[PDB]
Amino acid sequence: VKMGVLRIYLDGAYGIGKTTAAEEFLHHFAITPNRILLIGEPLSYWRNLAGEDAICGIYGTQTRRLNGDVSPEDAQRLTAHFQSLFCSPHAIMHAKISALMDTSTSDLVQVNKEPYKIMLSDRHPIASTICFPLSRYLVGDMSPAALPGLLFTLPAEPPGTNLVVCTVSLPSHLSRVSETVNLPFVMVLRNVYIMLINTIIFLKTNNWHAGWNTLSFCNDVFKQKLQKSECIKLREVPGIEDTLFAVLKLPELCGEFGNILPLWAWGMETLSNCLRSMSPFVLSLEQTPQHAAQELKTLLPQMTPANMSSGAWNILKELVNAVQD
Amino acid sequence: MGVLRIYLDGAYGIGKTTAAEEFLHHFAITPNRILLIGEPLSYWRNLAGEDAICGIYGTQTRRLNGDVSPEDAQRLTAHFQSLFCSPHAIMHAKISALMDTSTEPYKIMLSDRHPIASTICFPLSRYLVGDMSPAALPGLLFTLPAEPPGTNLVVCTVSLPSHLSRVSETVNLPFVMVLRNVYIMLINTIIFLKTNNWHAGWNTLSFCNDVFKQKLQKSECIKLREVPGIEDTLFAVLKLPELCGEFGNILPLWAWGMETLSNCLRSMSPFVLSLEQTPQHAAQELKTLLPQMTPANMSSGAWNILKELVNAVQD
Ligand SMILES: Nc1ncnc2c1ncn2[C@@H]1O[C@H](COP(=O)(O)OP(=O)(O)O)[C@@H](O)[C@H]1O
Ligand SMILES: O=c1[nH]c(=O)n([C@H]2C[C@H](O)[C@@H](COP(=O)(O)O)O2)cc1/C=C/Br
Ligand SMILES: O=c1[nH]c(=O)n([C@H]2C[C@H](O)[C@@H](COP(=O)(O)O)O2)cc1/C=C/Br
């Protein structure tokens, strides 16, 4: 009864327009209703996650830090708290979906006439568990203490994840927004995502323990560049220093001799395991939503497909519709 | 070959460690027959920079002195409490990978506390006592990973007046009284889950109110019972208005969450061990239980590996 689907997670910085451009893609291809399934960001839960408003809280906390209404040491812990709120929703979902995914190691008895059903999603779990938390650290708004809980506890990623990092020119990104507009965080966020990509590619060939002992620890000088120049350049064959491991080499995770502590190592392993499965793609949103979406279309043929029960797709759809409700 | 995964939990200060060790010294006559994994204090006391333990307690002291808003003190707590998760999880997740899921004296690998202690028992106790905001429950309860078959949860128990001497960190009835209660519920929940679905008498479960919380901090009510009912479980504590909508229905995602939370707890094989006596007895009793526990299968090779890893981090 099988049929191949196309899991596509659309990520990148915020305010860039990856949503009004992800929707304009649904209108001009969903000519046939059952050929595409969209899953939007769960604001409804973020803005009322068991009582607190993750969004307001993550920003308000910074405003509260500047006014000195709270200790900078607490403001960091306080941040970690809110930042973490974004995790659950996206995770409950992703975890369910991985369950409806057919991981059949076998030959095909029959083929399906129809084209592959593409299920588009707004942001991938790593955004909450790795991209943002890491950007907060780099900018100094959050304490590293919360990285293990998010980076090292990642669940096995099922084959076929297509991560599409959206990108916009810098001066244009600063208009799509004007929540708070401060270069430091943005400049970093953009950078991090670029690293993410380099990390995925990197991980495709080499192990995380590559030039680890050749990776200078993460210092304030490094963080400074990340908040100013948007350095980190996306490159053909990435090296350890063009990845996220450049940001993970932290004294707080290593011991006396300067070795990354045992557990934390095992963690790097799973974090690698996850990112490595992914199929990285970059999509420019520097133009009319029409183009952005058209471009995304040209990529469909390059993405890695996965298999799932025809029945399940119909179920998934209902669930997705049951919660985006 | 077949191993015996045994996780030893319960309240703190009770002595489940000096009694879990006295069990290793007596039956490890043959070296390769038993493997112990102790609590990773070394990481808790320096988890990427902060000392989870001091922070969870100090935050309370800081709350009483009014050095910080009670609203922040709650969020601040959630933060630290969460720190306890990673270590235990990195481990457990690795171990699940070395477990053979393929369709004479078995090697028993004893562990100090099971991940649910950090992700469900303690966080929940903090809530009930009012030291933590519910906002952090979904992140810990609903994101639980598939538990592999063969988990033997052994909840240790001590008499009340005796428990208050094993400790005297901070000694305050409210939290203890609750912690004891919660663990009892956990057990009742596991059993309960064996037969019925979480959506049983859900619509007959009164929401969680302050009156309820009050009893949980005073009488150690919650009694362990043969055939548990919805109200003797943890679901009695999970029915929260903050998780339900207007009409009073538990919101979609949170439901799916309950599902996975149930999925986990249900796999477990619950056992109660009394530490109200000489460590010798405590351990001897635990031995009598070995034959009742559910065994799992793993590569002989893996066991040797696991051992090395365990030894590699328990140094
Ligand atoms: N069965 C017992 N009888 C008397 N004292 C005990 C017993 N078990 C433990 N203790 C004492 O109480 C203290 C706390 O117990 P511990 O083993 O550390 O508990 P836990 O496993 O909860 O951390 C120990 O340092 C020990 O001296
Ligand atoms: O981890 C996060 N942290 C965060 O602060 N945010 C923030 C970023 C932004 O203000 C808002 C989400 O809106 P858009 O990203 O669609 O513009 O929440 C988002 C995530 C990620 C969720 Br997965
Ligand atoms: O989640 C937790 N939260 C917590 O505060 N603690 C606390 C409880 C205790 O002070 C200390 C651990 O010592 P024992 O439990 O062995 O006596 O950390 C522990 C856990 C659980 C880890 Br899994």
Q: Is B248 annotated as a binding residue?
A: no
Return all residues near B281 (Cβ < 8 A) that are at least 6 apart: none
Task: Retrieve residue B73's tokens.
Answer: 């003190």
Q: Kindly report the CA angle at A193 between A77 and A28, in degrees rounded to 5?
A: 120
* Length of chain B in terms of residues written: 315
Angstrom CA distances, B275 to B168, B189, B243, B272, stand at: 17, 22, 37, 10
- Beta pairing class for B152-157 and B2-10: parallel
- Provide the 3-class DSSP secondary structure of residue B7: strand
β strands within chain A, DSSP E = 3-12, 36-39, 117-122, 162-167, 279-284, 306-308
Angstrom CA distances, B231 to A319, B189, B221, B264, stand at: 29, 9, 12, 19
Eight-state DSSP code of residue A150: I
Q: Which of B14, B50, B76, B84 to mutate to test the pocket of ligand 3 (most atoms within 8 A of CB)?
A: B84
In angstroms, how far is the first alpha carbon of chain A from the final one? 29
In angstroms, the CA B313 to CA B315 distance is 5
Eight-state DSSP code of residue B56: H
Q: How far is CA B181 from the centre of its chain?
A: 12
Q: After which residues is chain A broken (C to N over 2.5 A)?
A: 178
Return all residues near A157 (Cβ < 8 A) that are at least 6 apart: A98, A273, A274, A277, A278
Residues of B in contact with A272 (CB under 8 A): none
In angstroms, the CA A9 to CA A166 distance is 11
B86 lines ligand 3 (CB under 6 A): no
- Resolution in units of Å: 3.2
Which of B82, B94, B125, B124 shows the shortest CA–CA distance to B261?
B124
* Ligand 2 neighbours by CB, cut-off 6 Å: A 14-15, 19, 41, 55, 58, 83, 86, 90, 123, 127-128, 132, 179
Phi, psi (5° rounding) for residue A203?
A: -60, -20
In angstroms, the CA B37 to CA A149 distance is 20
Q: How far is CA B99 from the centre of its chain?
A: 21
Calculate how close chain B gets to A104, using CA atoms only, in Å: 16
Q: Which residues of B291-311 are buried (b: 16+ CB within 10 A; e: fewer)?
A: eebebbebeeebbeebeebbe
Contact between residue B126 and residue B239 where contact means Cβ atoms under 8 Å apart: no
Q: Kindly report the CA angle at B199 between B197 and B201, in degrees rounded to 5?
A: 105
B80 lines ligand 3 (CB under 6 A): no
Residue in chain A lying closest to B239 (CA): A50
In angstroms, the CA A131 to CA A145 distance is 16
Contact between residue A88 and residue B139 where contact means Cβ atoms under 8 Å apart: yes
DSSP string, A220-237: HHHHHHHTTT------SS
Angstrom CA distances, A178 to A172, A173, B296, stand at: 11, 9, 58
Contact between residue B252 and residue A323 where contact means Cβ atoms under 8 Å apart: yes
The structure tokens 């592959």 sit at A116
Distance B158 CA to ligand 1 centre (A): 11
Q: How far is CA B205 from the centre of its chain?
A: 23
What architecture (CATH level 2) is domain A1-325? 3-Layer(aba) Sandwich (3.40)
Choose the closest CB to B133 out of A52, A93, A155: A52
Report the sign of the C-alpha dihedral through residues A185, A186, A188, A193, in that order: positive
Residues of A in contact with B262 (CB under 8 A): none
B281 lines ligand 1 (CB under 6 A): no
- Provide the 3-class DSSP secondary structure of residue A59: helix
In angstroms, the CA A52 to CA B135 distance is 6
Q: Which residues of A34-53 are buried (b: 16+ CB within 10 A; e: fewer)?
A: eebbbbbbbebbbeebbebb
Helix (H) or strand (E) holding B35: strand B34-37
Q: How many C-alpha atoms does A142 have within 13 Å on its Cβ side?
A: 24
Task: Retrieve residue A166's tokens.
Answer: 């959206």
- Provide the 3-class DSSP secondary structure of residue A217: coil
Q: Which of B12, B18, B176 to mutate to test the pocket of ligand 1 (most atoms within 8 A of CB)?
A: B18
Eight-state DSSP code of residue A275: H
- Provide the 3-class DSSP secondary structure of residue A141: coil
In this structure, what is the dihedral angle of CA atoms B306, B308, B313, B315, given to the nearest 10 degrees? 140
Q: How far is CA B239 from the centre of its chain?
A: 20
The structure tokens 């050095």 sit at B67
Q: Is B43 annotated as a binding residue?
A: no
- B1-315 classified as CATH 3.40.920.10: no
Type of residue numbered A244: L
* Domain boundaries of chain B, sorted by first residue: 1-315
User: Active-site residue A241, yes or no?
Assistant: no
Task: Retrieve residue B194's tokens.
Answer: 């064996």
Task: Retrieve residue B286's tokens.
Answer: 């635990």
Contact between residue A35 and residue A112 where contact means Cβ atoms under 8 Å apart: no
Q: Kindly report the CA angle at B111 between B110 and B115, in degrees rounded to 5?
A: 145
Nearest atom, ligand 2, residue A58 CA: 5
Experimental technique used to determine this entry: X-ray
